[PDB]
Design a protein around this nucleic acid. Structure first.
Ligand SMILES: *OP(=O)(O)OC[C@H]1O[C@@H](n2cnc3c(N)ncnc32)[C@H](O)[C@@H]1O
Length: 632
DNA sequence: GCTGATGCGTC
DNA sequence: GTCGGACTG
DNA sequence: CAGTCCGACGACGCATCAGC
């Protein structure tokens, strides 16, 4: 009985402690009971082990369900570059729920907002019990339902799913659709749990499996290490082929050990991008790399563009998330041929797309960049031109460069490509360990419009193996190598109820500057981070008192999300941020830099209260108007 | 056929 | 993109 | 102490669908 299924048990025997029949279909209730047991717990290690247990039973018992089960725990419809979308929102989900509960949208709505978890507002001849595999496909059905009137159709399935739910199934199905599963394990851990499962109870065995715990006899530490070694195998592979549709069947078919031999990098499938650690300044950069020659480069403020040239001539570009941006970029593709040497048969390029002034001949702001149509490659309709900045070469003429040093890689890159100003050009690099030198670069970097500096090592810990270290590169961000970036004092003019972790307190706030010509507090931006847990809990108390049933006459939100609660304006906070932009939603300093747009803060973060300031001695609209003005 | 509201991806 | 908190190394 | 990993939260602008 799956209602008693307990993947968190001790001496879990895959065959025995399973709660379905061999070769039969994995029950969702099993998947939910697992989710339950994981959430019961804090130890990531315990959580992975539990997930592992369901997994080992899936492998041993019902291999074809492994994929669905994985996707379910990952809460994803499928491969990134397939771009499936639930297309339910909160509100659709909401009405679905109210319908199924025989409640009214409001009561339901209220309860969800307050409890901060749709899953709880979520809980005759009921259908047969929900199958793990069935649930996923129903999800995939919802997603597929597009175009006109499709919403009611989407609602139909959800409600069905709900009426079908047997125990806690409801809440978990609710959260999934809500896009807020809250499991505590995502890609790494699920990857982890998969590796373990497949390592402890291998696929391929006639039933029942004569090898049920490959770890037996290993001491604990021993079993740990061994497990982590196996882990890296799967983990590095997914990295080059981050696509379960691909991995799993191969895994199941050849086992973890030989997985790599049968799953490789190939242009046309996106691979996971190398990431970056934030650095507190040159000091620490030199320390981290204090025994490793490194390079410096401009951190261009564009979007990342993985360029794939297939030997057959076609070419696909992917986002930081393996999303298919081919189509975004008709202009890029036609320019591909003049980008490479004749001998170059195939390549995978690491690049930033940047908004470009073919006229003024200069990098335009990232906002400019975001103005291009996403879908159509009506290549003539391109109002905003783009320039690619190259900085890495993953793969070249049949061969993967993944296991090569940045040195080798970059060299190959320069040696085989051909730049054209404002079209395609190598990132400005600098090779030093000189403190002042670096600082100089950093300033020139912002002086040529760049977030600042990337710092990468050249031949020490310097390959493209993300499984060893994703954030393997460092960024020096003007912010604190400056000393202290844009920072304002703003007035808290309303809270928003928080969810999940933020559940049951305030999740966020609405902040206003002070316009004195209007003599009113203009909502500037929302604020949702920077505070500690404690800090928050303290905030929740005081502000609680200040909740008013209406706004003050001097408060001006417009386009802004009506606070959940309106606060009595008194709290001034001190906020940092990376930049400024003309908001089409924010009144603060409207008319001052734009005739229409106000301005907001970019990457806003709470820093501390200024318990001396009153809201009128907050930061000022022309003060903001000032800051924005200085930006360019 | 248009407007507003929100999805969903970019940072 | 930004951020803290629990848990491991 | 440091690094992992997960999930709270930001402003924006194109795309999409309901309701008119
Ligand atoms: O801030 P972040 O953590 O999102 O930074 C990583 C991103 O920075 C962009 N970028 C710009 N220039 C470079 C160079 N020269 N090297 C590596 N990344 C660079 C990328 O879009 C990256 O995802």
């Amino acid at each position: 009985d799956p209602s008693g299924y307990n993947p968190a048990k001790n001496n879990y025997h895959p065959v025995e402690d399973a709660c379905w029949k061999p070769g039969q279909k994995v029950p969702y209730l099993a998947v939910a009971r697992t989710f339950e047991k994981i959430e019961e717990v804090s130890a990531r290690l315990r959580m992975v082990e539990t997930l592992s247990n369901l997994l080992r039973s899936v492998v041993a018992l019902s291999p074809p369900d492994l994929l669905p089960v994985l996707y379910l725990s990952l809460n994803h419809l499928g491969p990134p570059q397939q771009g499936l979308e639930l297309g339910v929102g909160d509100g659709v989900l909401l009405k679905a729920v109210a319908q199924a509960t025989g409640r009214q949208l409001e009561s339901v709505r209220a309860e969800a907002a307050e409890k901060g978890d749709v899953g709880l507002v979520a809980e005759m001849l009921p259908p047969p019990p929900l199958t793990a595999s069935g649930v996923f496909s129903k999800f995939r059905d919802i997603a597929r339902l597009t175009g006109s009137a499709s919403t009611a159709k989407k609602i139909d399935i959800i409600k069905g799913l709900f009426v079908a739910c047997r125990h806690s199934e409801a809440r978990f199905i609710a959260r999934s659709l809500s896009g807020r599963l809250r499991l505590g394990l995502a890609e790494q851990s699920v990857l982890a749990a998969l590796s373990q499962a497949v390592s402890l109870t291998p696929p391929g065995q006639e039933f029942p499996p004569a090898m049920v715990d490959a770890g037996k006899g290993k001491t604990a530490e021993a079993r740990k290490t061994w497990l982590e070694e196996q882990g890296m195998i799967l983990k590095q592979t997914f990295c080059e082929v981050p696509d379960l549709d691909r991995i799993i069947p191969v895994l199941l078919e050849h086992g973890l050990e030989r997985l790599p031999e049968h799953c490789k990098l190939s242009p046309g499938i996106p691979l996971k991008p190398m990431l970056a650690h934030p650095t507190r300044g040159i000091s620490e950069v030199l320390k981290r790399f204090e025994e490793a020659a490194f390079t410096c480069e401009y951190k261009y403020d564009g979007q990342r563009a993985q360029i794939h040239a297939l030997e057959g001539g076609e070419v696909k570009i992917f986002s930081r998330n393996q999303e298919d941006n081919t189509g975004k970029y008709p202009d890029i593709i036609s320019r591909i041929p003049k980008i490479k040497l004749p001998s170059v048969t195939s390549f995978i390029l690491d690049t930033e797309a940047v908004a470009w002034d073919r006229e003024k001949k200069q990098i335009q702001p990232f906002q400019v960049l975001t103005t291009r149509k996403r879908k159509e490659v009506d290549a003539s309709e391109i109002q905003v031109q783009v320039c690619l900045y190259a900085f890495d070469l993953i793969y070249l003429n049949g061969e993967s460069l993944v296991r090569e040093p940045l040195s080798r890689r970059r060299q190959l890159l320069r040696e085989n490509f051909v730049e054209t100003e404002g079209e395609f050009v190598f990132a400005t690099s600098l090779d030093t360990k000189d403190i002042e030198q670096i600082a100089e670069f950093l300033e020139q970097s912002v002086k040529d419009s760049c977030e600042g500096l990337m710092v990468k090592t050249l031949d020490v810990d310097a390959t493209y193996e993300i499984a060893k270290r994703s954030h393997n590169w460092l960024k020096l961000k003007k912010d604190y190598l400056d000393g202290v970036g844009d920072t304002l004092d703003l007035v808290v003019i309303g809270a928003y109820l928080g969810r999940g972790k933020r559940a049951g307190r305030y999740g966020g706030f609405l902040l206003a500057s002070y316009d004195e010509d209007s003599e009113e507090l203009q909502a500037i931006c929302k604020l949702g981070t920077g505070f500690s847990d404690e800090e928050l809990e303290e905030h929740h108390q005081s502000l609680k008192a200040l909740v008013l049933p209406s706004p003050r006459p001097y408060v001006r939100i417009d386009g802004a999300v009506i606070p959940d609660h309106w606060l009595d304006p008194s709290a001034v906070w001190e906020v940092k941020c990376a930049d400024l932009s003309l908001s089409p939603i924010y009144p603060a300093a409207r008319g001052l830099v734009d005739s229409d747009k106000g301005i907001s803060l970019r990457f806003p973060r709470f820093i501390r209260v200024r318990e001396d300031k009153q809201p009128e001695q907050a930061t000022t609209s022309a003060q903001v108007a000032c800051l924005y003005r200085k930006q360019s």
